Amino acid sequence: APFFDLGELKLWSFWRAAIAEFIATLLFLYITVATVIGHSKETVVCGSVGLLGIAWAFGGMIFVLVYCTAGISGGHINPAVTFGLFLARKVSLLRALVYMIAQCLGAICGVGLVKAFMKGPYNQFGGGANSVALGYNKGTALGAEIIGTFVLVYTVFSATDPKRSARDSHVPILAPLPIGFAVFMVHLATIPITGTGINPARSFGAAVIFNSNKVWDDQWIFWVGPFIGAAVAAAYHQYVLRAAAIKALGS
Amino acid sequence: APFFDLGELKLWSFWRAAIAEFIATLLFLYITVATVIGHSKETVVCGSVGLLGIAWAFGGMIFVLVYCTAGISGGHINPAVTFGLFLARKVSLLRALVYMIAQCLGAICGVGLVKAFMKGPYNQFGGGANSVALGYNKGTALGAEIIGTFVLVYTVFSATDPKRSARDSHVPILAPLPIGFAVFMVHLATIPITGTGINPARSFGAAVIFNSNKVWDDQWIFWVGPFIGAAVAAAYHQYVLRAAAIKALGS
Amino acid sequence: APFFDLGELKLWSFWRAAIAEFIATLLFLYITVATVIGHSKETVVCGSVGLLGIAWAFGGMIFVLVYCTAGISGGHINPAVTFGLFLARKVSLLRALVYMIAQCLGAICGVGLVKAFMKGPYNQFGGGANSVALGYNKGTALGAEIIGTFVLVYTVFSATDPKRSARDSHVPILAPLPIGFAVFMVHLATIPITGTGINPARSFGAAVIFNSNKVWDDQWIFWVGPFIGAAVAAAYHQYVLRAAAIKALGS
Amino acid sequence: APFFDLGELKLWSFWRAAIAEFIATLLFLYITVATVIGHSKETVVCGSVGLLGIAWAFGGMIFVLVYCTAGISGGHINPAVTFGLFLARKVSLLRALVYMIAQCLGAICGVGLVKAFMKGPYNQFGGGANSVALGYNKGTALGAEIIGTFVLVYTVFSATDPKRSARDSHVPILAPLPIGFAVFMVHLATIPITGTGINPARSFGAAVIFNSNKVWDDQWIFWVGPFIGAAVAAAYHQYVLRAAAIKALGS
């Protein structure tokens, strides 16, 4: 794999792909963390959208955002997704890094906006952030992040279009509904454990803005867990040897 | 941009497009505000569809209505959507205004019907209306409306079919599921703040029928916020320069 | 319109269409009423699927069942749907009546099965049945049934395939997801008022099995309301003059 | 029907199909049982994803997993599905057995992982397992499993692609969204009765790991019920005589 290929010299398109990932991740953090704080601050019992509503915010926004950006950037919104695809040689190292930076920056900005709008409840109720919950240890958290991210990245590889690519690149277009649903599902199982990270930029953006020592102590789990889950899904996709032209037929 | 083009002289189709927008918005207000009052009036704790159920009423009805009217009017159901498309020169000024009037009228009628059916609970529990909630200021509300409407209008532009148009027009057909989901998502984040407007006709219809001074004082936020969010999504779509024939591939 | 056409002399297919409607409606009543009783009997507060869960049972089962039977019968599962299509001359009188009978019979059987499985809770918690709730009058109930059924039947007409028909007939195939979603939405608004009928066979099956005088007194609303809502959606579809080959493009 | 056909001598593909079923079922058990324990352990009232959230975990994971594995194995994830298809002669005896073993093994492993991560709550709150709930008898449970599995398997047969098959086989590709929705629906009606089995490998995996005598006493219902429901859906599909090339047109 070279550091970069000719696609990365199509500078206009490559710039707009980075912007599309930046904005999408910003929007992803804003809606989901605002949903979280809005639920956490509610004084009436059953007065909120509930944990079910939070899981929907994360799954539904990934559906919407991959839908909007798949033809522009490939629709990653998530460094572990970008990392998996890079391992499968679907993304160059240079594009991979640019994507991760755009995603981490967008994440900080989105969470930033939630804090700007509701600083009181934002600081009071945990800042959106991922950390190990009471009654679990780090090994369980990490395990839950690995397997959770595997589900996500396994779904991404199955969702790739073998013939269609994002504008001026060979980065595969992705079917958004299955990927959104994978996210929703993993939140249902993983919210009691870590909040659910499965997305290093999502975890990072919230840790940057909330800036607590507890959250920073746990932060490595939300990089290492998803990167490992991503690598194991790539390995698996490579072994069920189904890159080729296994187009999954949508629902 | 001329005030109107030859499509607007196809009077039969242009009339039926206006009617389709009028009826759709009426149905949109009736189902969603009835869902709201039905939840608000419930005496049993967890005896209702909950805030999650309300968010679904708004997102799901937009999915259903854009599905039914996309081939007829372009499926706007929302003056900020019409406004964004007008800025992108996808709609003439004359069609734009006719649409907004049909949507505002339909909105009043739909809320009217909710009040006719359940006047007691209708007046008691807030009339469906949008206003700034306790503990937020006008700047937060406006900000939340801007960004919320941006998410919606960004999704609309990505959902446009570059080849297919509504009957006897060049108004693009829209993919309904992504747009419905955008609405659902924005409600999850924005219900604790304003009720969620992101739709001037939705906010106006409820303010007309509920007719409280508090709600009228706040009403400008629900026009200005969505119009700004819409204009920034148009600007953005124009800059990721993706009008051309970026057909987003559905889920 | 003749009483019948040559499609009705294709006896093998016509018989299997009737069977498909009978079974589908039976399955529709069994799952949805079982969901209702299961929620109603639950002793823990928030220990159930909630009203949101009930609305999903009705909307999701119609999605699933129209999906399974659309190519076989046209996927009606509902006499008001059959009635609307008959008014639009898409179904003959003979097929229409056979469908309504199969649907009413299947309905009784499905509710029958719920009672057989959980007779105690079945009788205690209202039998699944539709009736006017406390605090509303008959005119509101009827109005809510008219408009609710209009939403449903308006969606059906938009969901019709202008080129594809059920086996050995000219009965249009229907797009199931939009129709399922219409049902879900109308339940969100209408459950506090009548239970939501919008389906005479659904209301009839539950009234037959539950057999209370109160429920029988209200039963006419659940025939008259949906038949009127259906006729007004047909009239409307005929006037937005969009039978022709307005194929709504799916999501 | 011969014991096996030439497809089963394509050893590379046949091995990878078995692996795909093994992994998918493992992931199915892990996410859904983790969702169950996470809800069951929650100390705050309405502090969880609720029974609605659990029903979504089961329906949504089947949607995601059939989406990922349909082109690889046919996407069964469930011995009653495999059994139904075998009866319809769509799967050979040899492939059928290999699938059931891979599914049962994967199931044990997935539940195993949930216990490894949260052994305390895992043992305290029922291990994910299926059993007859208080206030119902075995005949009701069995009946509920039969009819529940019928809904599932009826949907599977309607979801089969008559032209497209899994890699190097004639096992039909399946439309995942309808099947996922069938699962979701049956959970809504059946959770108060048995937990919902409709999947012998799902019931077996949880019974193996939880290892209680009560759960083992009831276990036969979760094999016999779904196998019967599956056989009756096959019989029905054979009689509505719609194997041929009834392609259900997706939503």
PDB file of C-alpha atoms in Angstrom, chain C:
ATOM      1  CA  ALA C   1     -68.562  -2.239 -13.001  1.00  0.00           C
ATOM      2  CA  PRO C   2     -69.758  -5.804 -13.508  1.00  0.00           C
ATOM      3  CA  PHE C   3     -70.378  -7.932 -10.370  1.00  0.00           C
ATOM      4  CA  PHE C   4     -67.275  -9.975 -11.346  1.00  0.00           C
ATOM      5  CA  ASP C   5     -64.761 -10.239 -14.203  1.00  0.00           C
ATOM      6  CA  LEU C   6     -62.743 -13.105 -15.792  1.00  0.00           C
ATOM      7  CA  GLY C   7     -60.162 -12.908 -12.989  1.00  0.00           C
ATOM      8  CA  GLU C   8     -62.765 -14.332 -10.603  1.00  0.00           C
ATOM      9  CA  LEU C   9     -63.126 -17.462 -12.818  1.00  0.00           C
ATOM     10  CA  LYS C  10     -59.464 -18.286 -12.216  1.00  0.00           C
ATOM     11  CA  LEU C  11     -60.801 -20.316  -9.307  1.00  0.00           C
ATOM     12  CA  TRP C  12     -57.562 -21.808  -7.983  1.00  0.00           C
ATOM     13  CA  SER C  13     -55.943 -18.358  -7.622  1.00  0.00           C
ATOM     14  CA  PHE C  14     -59.083 -16.671  -6.395  1.00  0.00           C
ATOM     15  CA  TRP C  15     -59.485 -19.347  -3.690  1.00  0.00           C
ATOM     16  CA  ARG C  16     -55.829 -18.907  -2.577  1.00  0.00           C
ATOM     17  CA  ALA C  17     -56.174 -15.113  -2.455  1.00  0.00           C
ATOM     18  CA  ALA C  18     -59.166 -15.547  -0.129  1.00  0.00           C
ATOM     19  CA  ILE C  19     -57.197 -17.983   2.027  1.00  0.00           C
ATOM     20  CA  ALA C  20     -54.173 -15.603   2.114  1.00  0.00           C
ATOM     21  CA  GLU C  21     -56.442 -12.753   3.367  1.00  0.00           C
ATOM     22  CA  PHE C  22     -58.090 -15.107   5.922  1.00  0.00           C
ATOM     23  CA  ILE C  23     -54.744 -16.285   7.398  1.00  0.00           C
ATOM     24  CA  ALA C  24     -53.145 -12.846   7.309  1.00  0.00           C
ATOM     25  CA  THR C  25     -55.980 -11.242   9.219  1.00  0.00           C
ATOM     26  CA  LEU C  26     -55.963 -14.126  11.720  1.00  0.00           C
ATOM     27  CA  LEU C  27     -52.229 -13.586  12.305  1.00  0.00           C
ATOM     28  CA  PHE C  28     -52.794  -9.801  12.485  1.00  0.00           C
ATOM     29  CA  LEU C  29     -55.395 -10.172  15.304  1.00  0.00           C
ATOM     30  CA  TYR C  30     -53.470 -12.820  17.206  1.00  0.00           C
ATOM     31  CA  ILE C  31     -50.175 -10.883  17.468  1.00  0.00           C
ATOM     32  CA  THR C  32     -51.666  -7.466  18.079  1.00  0.00           C
ATOM     33  CA  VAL C  33     -54.333  -8.496  20.630  1.00  0.00           C
ATOM     34  CA  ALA C  34     -51.822 -10.767  22.453  1.00  0.00           C
ATOM     35  CA  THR C  35     -49.502  -7.706  22.605  1.00  0.00           C
ATOM     36  CA  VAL C  36     -52.377  -5.663  24.034  1.00  0.00           C
ATOM     37  CA  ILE C  37     -53.389  -8.169  26.735  1.00  0.00           C
ATOM     38  CA  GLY C  38     -49.695  -8.803  27.618  1.00  0.00           C
ATOM     39  CA  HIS C  39     -49.255  -5.068  28.289  1.00  0.00           C
ATOM     40  CA  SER C  40     -52.610  -4.631  30.076  1.00  0.00           C
ATOM     41  CA  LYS C  41     -52.020  -7.553  32.511  1.00  0.00           C
ATOM     42  CA  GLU C  42     -48.491  -6.493  33.567  1.00  0.00           C
ATOM     43  CA  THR C  43     -48.245  -5.804  37.311  1.00  0.00           C
ATOM     44  CA  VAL C  44     -44.847  -3.898  37.350  1.00  0.00           C
ATOM     45  CA  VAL C  45     -45.009  -0.176  36.346  1.00  0.00           C
ATOM     46  CA  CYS C  46     -42.952   0.199  33.054  1.00  0.00           C
ATOM     47  CA  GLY C  47     -42.763  -3.547  33.039  1.00  0.00           C
ATOM     48  CA  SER C  48     -44.363  -3.787  29.617  1.00  0.00           C
ATOM     49  CA  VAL C  49     -43.867  -2.850  25.951  1.00  0.00           C
ATOM     50  CA  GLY C  50     -46.040   0.174  26.642  1.00  0.00           C
ATOM     51  CA  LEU C  51     -48.519   1.924  24.369  1.00  0.00           C
ATOM     52  CA  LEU C  52     -45.576   2.598  22.014  1.00  0.00           C
ATOM     53  CA  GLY C  53     -45.056  -1.239  21.792  1.00  0.00           C
ATOM     54  CA  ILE C  54     -48.760  -1.738  21.030  1.00  0.00           C
ATOM     55  CA  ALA C  55     -48.685   0.877  18.220  1.00  0.00           C
ATOM     56  CA  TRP C  56     -45.645  -0.974  16.774  1.00  0.00           C
ATOM     57  CA  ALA C  57     -47.493  -4.342  16.884  1.00  0.00           C
ATOM     58  CA  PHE C  58     -50.267  -2.945  14.719  1.00  0.00           C
ATOM     59  CA  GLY C  59     -48.037  -1.015  12.263  1.00  0.00           C
ATOM     60  CA  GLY C  60     -45.322  -3.649  12.017  1.00  0.00           C
ATOM     61  CA  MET C  61     -47.731  -6.578  11.474  1.00  0.00           C
ATOM     62  CA  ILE C  62     -49.467  -4.696   8.612  1.00  0.00           C
ATOM     63  CA  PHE C  63     -45.980  -4.066   7.086  1.00  0.00           C
ATOM     64  CA  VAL C  64     -45.101  -7.788   7.411  1.00  0.00           C
ATOM     65  CA  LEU C  65     -48.492  -9.079   6.216  1.00  0.00           C
ATOM     66  CA  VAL C  66     -48.871  -6.749   3.189  1.00  0.00           C
ATOM     67  CA  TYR C  67     -45.264  -7.797   2.322  1.00  0.00           C
ATOM     68  CA  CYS C  68     -46.273 -11.515   2.435  1.00  0.00           C
ATOM     69  CA  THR C  69     -49.615 -11.312   0.701  1.00  0.00           C
ATOM     70  CA  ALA C  70     -49.355  -8.388  -1.789  1.00  0.00           C
ATOM     71  CA  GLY C  71     -48.361 -10.688  -4.700  1.00  0.00           C
ATOM     72  CA  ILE C  72     -51.068 -13.221  -3.696  1.00  0.00           C
ATOM     73  CA  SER C  73     -54.221 -11.238  -2.798  1.00  0.00           C
ATOM     74  CA  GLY C  74     -53.148  -7.580  -3.118  1.00  0.00           C
ATOM     75  CA  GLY C  75     -52.538  -7.501   0.655  1.00  0.00           C
ATOM     76  CA  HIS C  76     -55.605  -5.814   2.102  1.00  0.00           C
ATOM     77  CA  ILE C  77     -56.044  -7.369   5.578  1.00  0.00           C
ATOM     78  CA  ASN C  78     -58.739  -4.732   6.110  1.00  0.00           C
ATOM     79  CA  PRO C  79     -62.310  -4.272   4.718  1.00  0.00           C
ATOM     80  CA  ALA C  80     -61.927  -0.438   4.505  1.00  0.00           C
ATOM     81  CA  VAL C  81     -58.869  -0.940   2.248  1.00  0.00           C
ATOM     82  CA  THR C  82     -60.791  -3.433   0.128  1.00  0.00           C
ATOM     83  CA  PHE C  83     -63.769  -0.989   0.124  1.00  0.00           C
ATOM     84  CA  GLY C  84     -61.639   1.974  -1.040  1.00  0.00           C
ATOM     85  CA  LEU C  85     -60.080  -0.063  -3.851  1.00  0.00           C
ATOM     86  CA  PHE C  86     -63.552  -1.331  -4.862  1.00  0.00           C
ATOM     87  CA  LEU C  87     -64.791   2.295  -5.124  1.00  0.00           C
ATOM     88  CA  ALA C  88     -61.756   3.091  -7.332  1.00  0.00           C
ATOM     89  CA  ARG C  89     -62.785   0.091  -9.489  1.00  0.00           C
ATOM     90  CA  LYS C  90     -59.572  -1.750  -8.733  1.00  0.00           C
ATOM     91  CA  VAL C  91     -61.497  -4.649  -7.168  1.00  0.00           C
ATOM     92  CA  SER C  92     -64.809  -6.230  -8.417  1.00  0.00           C
ATOM     93  CA  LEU C  93     -67.840  -6.442  -6.131  1.00  0.00           C
ATOM     94  CA  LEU C  94     -67.548 -10.242  -5.946  1.00  0.00           C
ATOM     95  CA  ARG C  95     -63.828 -10.177  -4.939  1.00  0.00           C
ATOM     96  CA  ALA C  96     -64.476  -7.311  -2.533  1.00  0.00           C
ATOM     97  CA  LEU C  97     -67.163  -9.316  -0.640  1.00  0.00           C
ATOM     98  CA  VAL C  98     -65.204 -12.521  -0.574  1.00  0.00           C
ATOM     99  CA  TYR C  99     -62.224 -10.545   0.851  1.00  0.00           C
ATOM    100  CA  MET C 100     -64.291  -8.886   3.566  1.00  0.00           C
ATOM    101  CA  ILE C 101     -65.729 -12.215   4.663  1.00  0.00           C
ATOM    102  CA  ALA C 102     -62.285 -13.901   4.752  1.00  0.00           C
ATOM    103  CA  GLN C 103     -60.925 -10.920   6.764  1.00  0.00           C
ATOM    104  CA  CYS C 104     -63.827 -10.890   9.284  1.00  0.00           C
ATOM    105  CA  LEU C 105     -63.594 -14.694   9.761  1.00  0.00           C
ATOM    106  CA  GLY C 106     -59.787 -14.554  10.143  1.00  0.00           C
ATOM    107  CA  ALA C 107     -60.143 -11.742  12.634  1.00  0.00           C
ATOM    108  CA  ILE C 108     -62.548 -13.740  14.864  1.00  0.00           C
ATOM    109  CA  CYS C 109     -60.195 -16.694  14.754  1.00  0.00           C
ATOM    110  CA  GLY C 110     -57.145 -14.663  15.705  1.00  0.00           C
ATOM    111  CA  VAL C 111     -58.787 -13.001  18.691  1.00  0.00           C
ATOM    112  CA  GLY C 112     -60.247 -16.448  19.524  1.00  0.00           C
ATOM    113  CA  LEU C 113     -56.733 -17.804  19.821  1.00  0.00           C
ATOM    114  CA  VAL C 114     -55.648 -14.970  22.158  1.00  0.00           C
ATOM    115  CA  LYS C 115     -58.667 -15.779  24.456  1.00  0.00           C
ATOM    116  CA  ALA C 116     -57.843 -19.542  24.276  1.00  0.00           C
ATOM    117  CA  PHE C 117     -54.287 -18.767  25.473  1.00  0.00           C
ATOM    118  CA  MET C 118     -54.978 -16.267  28.225  1.00  0.00           C
ATOM    119  CA  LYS C 119     -58.719 -16.288  28.995  1.00  0.00           C
ATOM    120  CA  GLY C 120     -58.311 -14.753  32.457  1.00  0.00           C
ATOM    121  CA  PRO C 121     -56.370 -11.652  31.324  1.00  0.00           C
ATOM    122  CA  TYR C 122     -58.295 -11.663  28.014  1.00  0.00           C
ATOM    123  CA  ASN C 123     -61.659 -11.058  29.737  1.00  0.00           C
ATOM    124  CA  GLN C 124     -60.266  -8.879  32.537  1.00  0.00           C
ATOM    125  CA  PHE C 125     -58.516  -6.276  30.378  1.00  0.00           C
ATOM    126  CA  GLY C 126     -60.966  -5.511  27.602  1.00  0.00           C
ATOM    127  CA  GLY C 127     -60.583  -8.280  25.002  1.00  0.00           C
ATOM    128  CA  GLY C 128     -58.550  -6.205  22.562  1.00  0.00           C
ATOM    129  CA  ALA C 129     -61.826  -4.419  21.619  1.00  0.00           C
ATOM    130  CA  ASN C 130     -62.494  -0.957  20.199  1.00  0.00           C
ATOM    131  CA  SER C 131     -64.870   1.389  22.057  1.00  0.00           C
ATOM    132  CA  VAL C 132     -65.228   5.125  22.796  1.00  0.00           C
ATOM    133  CA  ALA C 133     -62.930   6.019  25.707  1.00  0.00           C
ATOM    134  CA  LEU C 134     -64.004   8.161  28.748  1.00  0.00           C
ATOM    135  CA  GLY C 135     -64.078  11.881  28.107  1.00  0.00           C
ATOM    136  CA  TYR C 136     -64.839  11.691  24.392  1.00  0.00           C
ATOM    137  CA  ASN C 137     -68.227  11.458  22.728  1.00  0.00           C
ATOM    138  CA  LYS C 138     -69.357   9.383  19.714  1.00  0.00           C
ATOM    139  CA  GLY C 139     -68.845  12.274  17.272  1.00  0.00           C
ATOM    140  CA  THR C 140     -65.215  12.659  18.235  1.00  0.00           C
ATOM    141  CA  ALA C 141     -64.677   8.891  17.997  1.00  0.00           C
ATOM    142  CA  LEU C 142     -66.305   8.784  14.594  1.00  0.00           C
ATOM    143  CA  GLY C 143     -64.323  11.808  13.438  1.00  0.00           C
ATOM    144  CA  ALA C 144     -61.084  10.228  14.651  1.00  0.00           C
ATOM    145  CA  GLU C 145     -61.960   6.995  12.814  1.00  0.00           C
ATOM    146  CA  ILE C 146     -62.763   8.868   9.588  1.00  0.00           C
ATOM    147  CA  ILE C 147     -59.560  10.834   9.529  1.00  0.00           C
ATOM    148  CA  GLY C 148     -57.442   7.929  10.736  1.00  0.00           C
ATOM    149  CA  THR C 149     -58.780   5.681   7.991  1.00  0.00           C
ATOM    150  CA  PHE C 150     -58.332   8.467   5.431  1.00  0.00           C
ATOM    151  CA  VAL C 151     -54.548   8.597   6.345  1.00  0.00           C
ATOM    152  CA  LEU C 152     -54.377   4.818   5.886  1.00  0.00           C
ATOM    153  CA  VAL C 153     -56.308   4.672   2.589  1.00  0.00           C
ATOM    154  CA  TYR C 154     -54.607   7.774   1.146  1.00  0.00           C
ATOM    155  CA  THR C 155     -51.290   5.946   1.807  1.00  0.00           C
ATOM    156  CA  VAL C 156     -52.598   2.737   0.175  1.00  0.00           C
ATOM    157  CA  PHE C 157     -53.570   4.510  -3.062  1.00  0.00           C
ATOM    158  CA  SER C 158     -50.113   6.182  -3.187  1.00  0.00           C
ATOM    159  CA  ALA C 159     -48.516   2.758  -2.569  1.00  0.00           C
ATOM    160  CA  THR C 160     -50.194   1.011  -5.489  1.00  0.00           C
ATOM    161  CA  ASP C 161     -48.006  -0.329  -8.269  1.00  0.00           C
ATOM    162  CA  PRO C 162     -49.490   0.878 -11.603  1.00  0.00           C
ATOM    163  CA  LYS C 163     -47.807  -1.990 -13.534  1.00  0.00           C
ATOM    164  CA  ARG C 164     -47.733  -4.974 -11.165  1.00  0.00           C
ATOM    165  CA  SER C 165     -50.718  -6.956  -9.938  1.00  0.00           C
ATOM    166  CA  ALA C 166     -51.420  -9.849  -7.612  1.00  0.00           C
ATOM    167  CA  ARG C 167     -51.292 -13.378  -9.180  1.00  0.00           C
ATOM    168  CA  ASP C 168     -53.895 -13.914 -11.997  1.00  0.00           C
ATOM    169  CA  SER C 169     -55.716 -10.608 -11.237  1.00  0.00           C
ATOM    170  CA  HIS C 170     -55.513  -6.885 -11.896  1.00  0.00           C
ATOM    171  CA  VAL C 171     -55.578  -6.114  -8.174  1.00  0.00           C
ATOM    172  CA  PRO C 172     -52.522  -3.778  -7.647  1.00  0.00           C
ATOM    173  CA  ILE C 173     -49.537  -4.871  -5.635  1.00  0.00           C
ATOM    174  CA  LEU C 174     -48.942  -2.474  -2.682  1.00  0.00           C
ATOM    175  CA  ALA C 175     -45.639  -1.121  -1.158  1.00  0.00           C
ATOM    176  CA  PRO C 176     -45.815  -2.500   2.398  1.00  0.00           C
ATOM    177  CA  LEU C 177     -43.487  -0.211   4.417  1.00  0.00           C
ATOM    178  CA  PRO C 178     -45.425   3.103   3.881  1.00  0.00           C
ATOM    179  CA  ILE C 179     -48.745   1.348   4.683  1.00  0.00           C
ATOM    180  CA  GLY C 180     -47.332  -0.259   7.820  1.00  0.00           C
ATOM    181  CA  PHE C 181     -46.018   3.175   8.878  1.00  0.00           C
ATOM    182  CA  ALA C 182     -49.405   4.838   8.276  1.00  0.00           C
ATOM    183  CA  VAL C 183     -51.004   2.303  10.641  1.00  0.00           C
ATOM    184  CA  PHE C 184     -48.287   2.868  13.273  1.00  0.00           C
ATOM    185  CA  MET C 185     -48.788   6.679  13.057  1.00  0.00           C
ATOM    186  CA  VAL C 186     -52.572   6.560  13.316  1.00  0.00           C
ATOM    187  CA  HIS C 187     -52.297   4.324  16.406  1.00  0.00           C
ATOM    188  CA  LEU C 188     -50.044   6.915  18.079  1.00  0.00           C
ATOM    189  CA  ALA C 189     -52.792   9.602  17.710  1.00  0.00           C
ATOM    190  CA  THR C 190     -55.900   7.382  18.065  1.00  0.00           C
ATOM    191  CA  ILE C 191     -55.173   4.818  20.852  1.00  0.00           C
ATOM    192  CA  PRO C 192     -56.337   7.284  23.629  1.00  0.00           C
ATOM    193  CA  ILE C 193     -59.650   7.777  21.758  1.00  0.00           C
ATOM    194  CA  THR C 194     -60.996   4.409  20.512  1.00  0.00           C
ATOM    195  CA  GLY C 195     -58.178   1.946  20.792  1.00  0.00           C
ATOM    196  CA  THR C 196     -57.827   2.741  16.994  1.00  0.00           C
ATOM    197  CA  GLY C 197     -60.075   0.713  14.680  1.00  0.00           C
ATOM    198  CA  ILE C 198     -59.433   1.896  11.080  1.00  0.00           C
ATOM    199  CA  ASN C 199     -60.139  -1.712  10.205  1.00  0.00           C
ATOM    200  CA  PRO C 200     -63.728  -3.079  10.478  1.00  0.00           C
ATOM    201  CA  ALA C 201     -62.575  -6.701  10.570  1.00  0.00           C
ATOM    202  CA  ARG C 202     -60.132  -5.920  13.425  1.00  0.00           C
ATOM    203  CA  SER C 203     -62.964  -4.207  15.371  1.00  0.00           C
ATOM    204  CA  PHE C 204     -65.505  -6.960  14.528  1.00  0.00           C
ATOM    205  CA  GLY C 205     -63.253  -9.930  15.463  1.00  0.00           C
ATOM    206  CA  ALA C 206     -62.586  -8.430  18.893  1.00  0.00           C
ATOM    207  CA  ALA C 207     -66.305  -7.539  19.449  1.00  0.00           C
ATOM    208  CA  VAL C 208     -67.377 -11.093  18.509  1.00  0.00           C
ATOM    209  CA  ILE C 209     -64.943 -12.714  20.984  1.00  0.00           C
ATOM    210  CA  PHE C 210     -65.151 -10.209  23.845  1.00  0.00           C
ATOM    211  CA  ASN C 211     -68.968 -10.018  23.480  1.00  0.00           C
ATOM    212  CA  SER C 212     -69.746  -7.089  25.799  1.00  0.00           C
ATOM    213  CA  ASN C 213     -72.819  -4.847  25.365  1.00  0.00           C
ATOM    214  CA  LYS C 214     -70.823  -1.653  25.661  1.00  0.00           C
ATOM    215  CA  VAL C 215     -68.511  -2.802  22.815  1.00  0.00           C
ATOM    216  CA  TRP C 216     -71.455  -3.881  20.647  1.00  0.00           C
ATOM    217  CA  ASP C 217     -73.153  -0.485  21.210  1.00  0.00           C
ATOM    218  CA  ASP C 218     -70.110   1.321  19.826  1.00  0.00           C
ATOM    219  CA  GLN C 219     -69.388  -1.127  16.988  1.00  0.00           C
ATOM    220  CA  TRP C 220     -71.134   0.826  14.198  1.00  0.00           C
ATOM    221  CA  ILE C 221     -68.509   3.647  14.523  1.00  0.00           C
ATOM    222  CA  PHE C 222     -65.834   1.112  13.474  1.00  0.00           C
ATOM    223  CA  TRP C 223     -67.626   0.283  10.262  1.00  0.00           C
ATOM    224  CA  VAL C 224     -69.101   3.620   9.311  1.00  0.00           C
ATOM    225  CA  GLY C 225     -66.037   5.702  10.245  1.00  0.00           C
ATOM    226  CA  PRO C 226     -63.548   3.611   8.195  1.00  0.00           C
ATOM    227  CA  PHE C 227     -65.891   3.167   5.253  1.00  0.00           C
ATOM    228  CA  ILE C 228     -66.332   6.959   5.088  1.00  0.00           C
ATOM    229  CA  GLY C 229     -62.590   7.620   5.545  1.00  0.00           C
ATOM    230  CA  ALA C 230     -61.948   5.080   2.750  1.00  0.00           C
ATOM    231  CA  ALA C 231     -64.474   6.678   0.412  1.00  0.00           C
ATOM    232  CA  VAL C 232     -63.040  10.186   0.956  1.00  0.00           C
ATOM    233  CA  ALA C 233     -59.432   8.892   0.247  1.00  0.00           C
ATOM    234  CA  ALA C 234     -60.736   7.280  -2.986  1.00  0.00           C
ATOM    235  CA  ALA C 235     -62.454  10.531  -3.966  1.00  0.00           C
ATOM    236  CA  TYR C 236     -59.272  12.428  -3.162  1.00  0.00           C
ATOM    237  CA  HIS C 237     -56.982  10.019  -5.125  1.00  0.00           C
ATOM    238  CA  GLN C 238     -59.439  10.306  -8.100  1.00  0.00           C
ATOM    239  CA  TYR C 239     -59.178  14.211  -7.847  1.00  0.00           C
ATOM    240  CA  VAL C 240     -55.394  14.663  -7.293  1.00  0.00           C
ATOM    241  CA  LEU C 241     -56.028  12.454 -10.452  1.00  0.00           C
ATOM    242  CA  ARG C 242     -53.061  10.264  -9.656  1.00  0.00           C
ATOM    243  CA  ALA C 243     -54.214   6.663 -10.270  1.00  0.00           C
ATOM    244  CA  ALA C 244     -52.792   6.750 -13.717  1.00  0.00           C
ATOM    245  CA  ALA C 245     -49.168   5.835 -13.374  1.00  0.00           C
ATOM    246  CA  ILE C 246     -48.153   7.775 -10.324  1.00  0.00           C
ATOM    247  CA  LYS C 247     -45.731   5.191  -9.014  1.00  0.00           C
ATOM    248  CA  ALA C 248     -44.456   6.532  -5.691  1.00  0.00           C
ATOM    249  CA  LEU C 249     -40.744   5.826  -5.507  1.00  0.00           C
ATOM    250  CA  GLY C 250     -40.136   3.759  -2.467  1.00  0.00           C
ATOM    251  CA  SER C 251     -38.364   4.187   0.701  1.00  0.00           C
TER     252      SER C 251
END
